[model samples]
Structures are given as C-alpha cells and as structure tokens.
Target: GGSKENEISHHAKEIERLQKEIERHKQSIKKLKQSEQSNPPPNPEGTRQARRNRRRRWRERQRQKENEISHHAKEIERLQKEIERHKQSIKKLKQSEC
Candidate 1:
C-alpha cells in the first residue's frame, strides 16, 4: 500500500509540474507581446532585427518546454502502466490464496 500510494503521489506531482510549465509558457508569450507593445521596435532595419531575434528565442523556449512536457507525459504513462501491473499481480495473489 505504501509503495503504491507513493507511486500514485509521485505521478500526481509530476502532472502538476507539467501543468505549471504549460502555464509558464503561456505567460512567456504574454511577456513577449507586452515587450513588443511597450518598446515598439525602432526603425525599419532594427525592427527586422528584433523580429528575428525574438523569433529565435521564442522558438528555442517553445521547443524546450514541449520536449520537457512530452518527457513528463511519457513518465506518467509508464508509472500508470506499472501501477496497473502491480494491481493485477495483487489480484492474482489474492485469488491464489483463496
């Protein structure tokens, strides 16, 4: 019971963390929008420069966050499968005792 509950709790925490990360990425987009509105770029040449730079940074963060989220999701799936396997084992053991 202890180990099973621990696994469940761990998976729950991981899910929570991933959800928070998703929110953070959404906030990052908001920040970028706010920055653009407040600064307004500059001249045409610098405006292009800012666009390119911002694009690169945004792409990098987005890619990183997505990868992390995917990894966490896989971990959660693995844990769930493990829990199911253990449950089946316990059920078989109880039936054998009966």
Candidate 2:
C-alpha cells in the first residue's frame, strides 16, 4: 500500500477546495462592483437639503460594499498562503521518499 501517498492526496484536495472557496468570494465581489445605485429617486416634495441627505446615505452604503470587498480580498490572501504551505508540504514529502 502506498500509504505514504495519503498525505499528498489530502493536501491536494484541500488546495482544490480552497480554490473553489476563493472563486465564490471573488464572484461576490464582482457582483458588488457591478452594482450601481448612484442617484436617489426624485422625491415629489423634496428640498435640496433632503437630496443631499439621501445621497450621503447612498455613499455610506457604497462604503459598506467596499468593506465586503476588503473581506473577500483578505480571504483570498489567506487561502493563497495556505495553498503555498500545502505545496511546500508536498515538496518535502517527495524529497523524503525512501
């Protein structure tokens, strides 16, 4: 039995799973980026001050999406680090082949 090969297969599968995870997050950020709600609806009886207030609220909402983007980007970074570590593990296993 090539039981020594178990470690390599496990790590390789984990890497593939992490890649899929990263893709899901990346797609979320892509959709968030593609969204647009730039202008507030025209109010039937609104003063200029009211529009400014609504616009400011919209800006804050935009920032919320950016915050999510930051989250996904960081997740990608962390997963990439994990992938690197797994690759290193695989390299060492092959080196230690008896």
Candidate 3:
C-alpha cells in the first residue's frame, strides 16, 4: 500500500531542491546589487540603457525567487496534510483494534 511516510519523504526532497534554487537566485540578485553599488552608472542616455538592463535582470531573478517560494509553501502544506491524514488513519485503526 502507498504510505504517507513515503509521500512526505518525496515531497521533502522536492522542497529541498526548490529551496536550493531559491538560494541561487537570491545570491545572483545579491551579486547584481553589489556590482551596481560598486560601479555606479552615469546619467547619460547610453548609460541609462545599461541601468535599465541591469534592473531587468534583477527583476527577473526576483520574480523567479517569488515563484519558487510560492511553490515551496504549497508543497509544505501538502506534506502537512498528508501527515494529518496518516495520523487520522492510525487513530481509526487503533480504535478498531480496541
């Protein structure tokens, strides 16, 4: 029979993977910010394009992290529900045996 323990384990692994991805995105954003701070851009039209490009990259990475976090939260919720359901099953079985 399929077990909640196994399902939870699988979900846990997925959550870990997602967290790693999120961390990587965060690091990328951090690096971008550091670079921007260290070498400030000029106010000319040409340099303005560069600033816009950098901002776009940062925004994309931020969006990715946000999505990953949302998915991670959902997976955690799924795991918790599985645990609760497993507990309920055990309780019912115990009552039956009594």
C-alpha lDDT score of every prediction, in listed order: 0.69, 0.63, 0.71
Residue lDDT tens for model 3, 29-62:
8677887678755557767777888888886667
* Top lDDT hit: 3
Backbone clashes in model 3, listed as residue pairs: none
Model 3, position 94, has a per-residue lDDT of 89
lDDT tens digits by residue: candidate 2, 1-98: 47968888887687656555555665577676656634444656658788778878875555555554665677776333435342367777788895
Tens digit of per-residue lDDT, candidate 1, span 2-98: 6788888988787777656665675678677887678654567757867988888886677556756677677776333435332367878888997
What's the number of clashes in each of the models? 0, 0, 0
Off by over 4 Å in 2: 1-5, 33-98
**Residue 8 lDDT (model 2):** 82
Q: What is the C-alpha RMSD of each candidate to the true structure, in Å?
A: 19.2, 19.4, 18.5
lDDT of 3 at 7: 87
Q: What's the distance in Å from true for residue 9, model 1?
A: 0.9
**TM-score against truth, every candidate:** 0.24, 0.26, 0.28
